[PDB]
Design a protein around this ligand. Structure first.
Ligand SMILES: CCCCCCCCCCCCCCCCCC(=O)OC[C@H](COP(=O)([O-])OCC(O)COP(=O)([O-])OC[C@@H](COC(=O)CCCCCCCCCCCCCCCCC)OC(=O)CCCCCCCCCCCCCCCCC)OC(=O)CCCCCCCCCCCCCCCCC
Ligand code: HEC
Ligand code: HEC
Ligand SMILES: CCCCCCCCCCCCCCCC(=O)OC[C@H](C)OC(=O)CCCCCCCC[C@@H](C)CCCCCCCC
Ligand SMILES: CCCCCCCCCCCCCCCC(=O)O
Ligand SMILES: CCCCCCCCCCCCCCCC(=O)O
Lengths: 232, 22, 153, 102, 51
């Protein structure tokens, strides 16, 4: 549409201006060129609340979104008019796919055969930078791979499609549509499934199970020993 | 101690691949 | 401490395919420059020429030469102040629309496909009315329709 | 400790760069119970120099030409899964292929 | 304890009488070492009433 670009550049001209310049060419040490990033990179950065940057540091943070859905799409439309790259994934009718990228053979619930394959893909070269169940991990110097709980499925797709920050970029040629959908299936299944037995201590692993016991577990038993025995 | 056998580049390089077979 | 003069966010680049030339005190910029080559042997150049110069002049582009042969432009008007020239292959240019709000010109390009290798680098050269910009650009396939592309296997 | 699966290059074998598709065994139940076929399934597949965007990384494994089961000559009755899983399970076989920005 | 693999006959499956040929795996040496394959080999074979 035309009005979309029209009112999508107004929001750009009063926000994304100091960094990125007038013609999306970038500023020296403020922000990169938005030329060729695509309609899918603006969606991920703006909707997820990442953009705009407030201060330069090791790594930009996810925060409260500044713009709504419609405003995000207008800015995306304006940006993509300056030479477009990856676009948003749609479904049947004109609409953003959300609960459709929950597996290749997804109908109304996640197929157990999709999480199996998605799990190995998400662990082939994606379970390292982050965590096992995407709980987050550390990086070089003040950077990190964030916890995956806060992202919707469109954000996941657009995250891998146009690798932001240090996150490597995964094109369709590398990880096909089906593979990406399987990865989303695994991500959304491990998040939304309670632990079969116990209170999963943030799923961090041996470091969280050892703090619960070595600092809190032993203290209760000491208190029991202090109750039975004497102080003299 | 500093480094075994790894040394820097001999001379800076550039090329064009242009791997063709029509 | 990570928010010093050298940070890991300010120094970041476009995270796209193909580099750029000129930063601050340059009349003409080129952004996102590659040699697109479709799977089934259709070639062209992607770039974006921004005419940002204090002394507003006329910086019309005469020709583009990838390695040895020229490129078929589409009689683009000269780039004025706060303008742009977005160029790509026609097939990948039908996906986006010309704005009427600013001043952005969409142009289609084509080549002969002499024998460019995917992953290789070739010395693209732009010749304007005044000056030439030479940059090495990668050869890559255009971005796929996102979310529809499965495996043959 | 001198050798990995890539040493096959020295003795005139053509090894490709095999990308892991993480394919699993497929269930096929018909009249004689249920069986996991894993035939016609290839977990390592050949990759092209256009399959990777700038500033990306992909783990590749030494896939010799003998155990390739994709492309124009895909045989849906050829079983190569166990050999490809031997390749992927080599202690020193994994190689990360990085496409750098221009 | 009720079923014996011959029970497949009651499920409209055509079960033969399989003679055991005691066939073993075949060794195959290639560019990629030696491996044992059991592709062409049939352990059980159909039998005739003149055999
Ligand atoms: C909901 C309900 C949940 C609340 C649960 C509260 C737990 C109560 C523990 C028993 C209290 C023991 C005691 O005498 O007081 C200790 C302590 C002081 O007693 P003291 O006379 O000064 O100590 C003398 C000797 O050193 C101590 O005497 P001693 O050396 O002869 O031995 C007696 C032994 C007795 O203890 C035992 O028998 C321990 C045996 C362990 C068994 C292992 C089972 C597994 O106690 C000890 O040895 C060490 C103290 C044990 C208690 C330490 C506090 C742990 C509770 C965590 C703090 C508050 C959490 C509650 C939060 C509110 C939730 C709604 O009081 C506390 O701090 C208890 C906190 C309770 C606050 C009340 C408000 C909470 C309820 C909210 C209502 C709504
Ligand atoms: C492969 C299957 C994956 C998946 C599912 C995810 N990643 Fe990463 N990632 C990394 C870094 C440093 C970032 C910062 C991005 C930014 O905020 O600009 C990311 C980004 C994400 C997101 C978005 C965050 C959110 O919405 O919560 C998600 C959902 C995500 N990733 C999951 C780190 C890496 C990395 C190396 C450092 C690799 C490889 C990956 N990520 C790949 C994947
Ligand atoms: C300092 C202010 C700053 C503002 C304001 C700002 N940006 Fe950015 N932007 C950056 C920096 C720095 C990066 C570097 C990458 C990163 O940290 O994510 C960036 C990266 C991006 C990217 C990722 C491009 C890529 O693939 O490399 C997009 C898209 C983007 N910005 C769009 C926007 C949009 C839309 C707004 C709308 C207001 C905006 N920006 C406002 C500084 C800013
Ligand atoms: C208590 C703990 C003390 C906490 C300090 C927190 C330091 C402020 C954060 C700034 C920073 O770290 O960024 C790097 C810096 C900009 O660059 C520098 O060079 C650092 C200055 C040299 C360091 C001398 C400090 C001496 C340490 C002693 C005080 C320790 C106890 C004896
Ligand atoms: C105090 C011990 C420091 C070690 C000295 C280094 C010896 C160099 C030998 C060679 O390599
Ligand atoms: C803990 C005390 C730190 C005082 C010094 C602050 C100056 C360093 C600034 C950086 O950031």
């Amino acid at each position: 549409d035309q009005a979309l670009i029209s009112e999508g550049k107004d929001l750009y001209d009063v926000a994304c201006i100091t960094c990125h310049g007038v013609n999306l060419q970038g500023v020296e040490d403020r922000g990169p060129s938005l030329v060729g990033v695509g309609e899918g990179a603006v969606y991920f950065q703006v909707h997820s609340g990442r953009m705009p940057i407030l201060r330069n540091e090791a790594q930009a943070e996810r925060k409260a979104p500044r713009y709504t859905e419609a405003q995000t799409l207008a800015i995306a439309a304006y940006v993509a008019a300056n030479g477009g790259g990856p676009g948003l994934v749609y479904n049947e009718d004109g609409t953003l796919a959300m609960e459709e990228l929950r597996g290749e053979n997804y109908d109304g619930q996640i197929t157990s055969a999709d999480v199996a394959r998605g799990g190995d893909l998400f662990r082939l070269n994606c379970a390292s930078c982050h965590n096992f169940t995407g709980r987050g991990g550390a990086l070089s110097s003040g950077k990190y791979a964030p916890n995956l709980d806060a992202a919707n499925e469109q954000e996941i797709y657009q995250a891998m499609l146009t690798g932001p920050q240090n996150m490597p970029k995964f094109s369709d040629r590398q990880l096909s549509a089906d593979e990406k959908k399987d990865i989303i299936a695994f991500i959304k299944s491990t998040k939304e499934t309670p632990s079969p037995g116990g209170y999963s201590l943030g799923s961090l692993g041996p470091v969280a199970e050892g703090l619960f016991m070595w600092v809190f577990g032993i203290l209760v038993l000491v208190a029991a020993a202090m109750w039975i025995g004497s102080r003299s | 101690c500093x480094x075994x056998x790894x040394x820097x580049x001999x001379x800076x390089x550039x090329x064009x691949x242009x791997x063709x077979x029509x | 401490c990570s928010a010093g003069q050298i940070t890991q966010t300010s120094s970041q680049v476009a995270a796209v395919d193909g580099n750029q030339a000129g930063s601050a005190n340059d009349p003409v910029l080129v952004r996102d420059v590659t040699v697109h080559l479709t799977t089934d042997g259709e070639a062209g150049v992607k770039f974006t020429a921004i005419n940002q110069d204090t002394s507003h002049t006329s910086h019309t582009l005469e020709s583009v030469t990838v390695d040895g042969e020229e490129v078929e432009l589409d009689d683009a008007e000269p780039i004025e102040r706060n303008c742009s020239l977005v160029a790509d292959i026609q097939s990948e240019l039908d996906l986006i629309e010309e704005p009427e709000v600013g001043c952005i010109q969409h142009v289609a390009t084509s080549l002969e496909n002499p024998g460019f290798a995917y992953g290789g680098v070739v010395p693209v050269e732009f010749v304007f009315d005044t000056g030439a910009i030479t940059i090495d650009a990668t050869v890559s396939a255009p971005v796929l329709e996102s979310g529809v592309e499965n495996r043959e296997v | 400790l001198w050798t990995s699966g890539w040493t096959l290059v020295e003795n005139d074998v053509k090894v490709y760069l095999g990308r892991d598709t993480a394919a699993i065994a497929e269930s096929h139940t018909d009249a004689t119970g249920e069986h996991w076929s894993t035939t016609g399934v290839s977990r390592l597949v050949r990759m092209r120099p256009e399959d990777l965007a700038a500033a990306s990384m992909e783990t590749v494994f030494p896939l010799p030409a003998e155990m390739v089961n994709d492309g124009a000559e895909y045989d849906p009755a050829k079983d190569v899964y166990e050999h490809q899983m031997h390749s992927v399970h080599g202690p020193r076989n994994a190689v990360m292929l990085i496409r750098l920005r221009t």
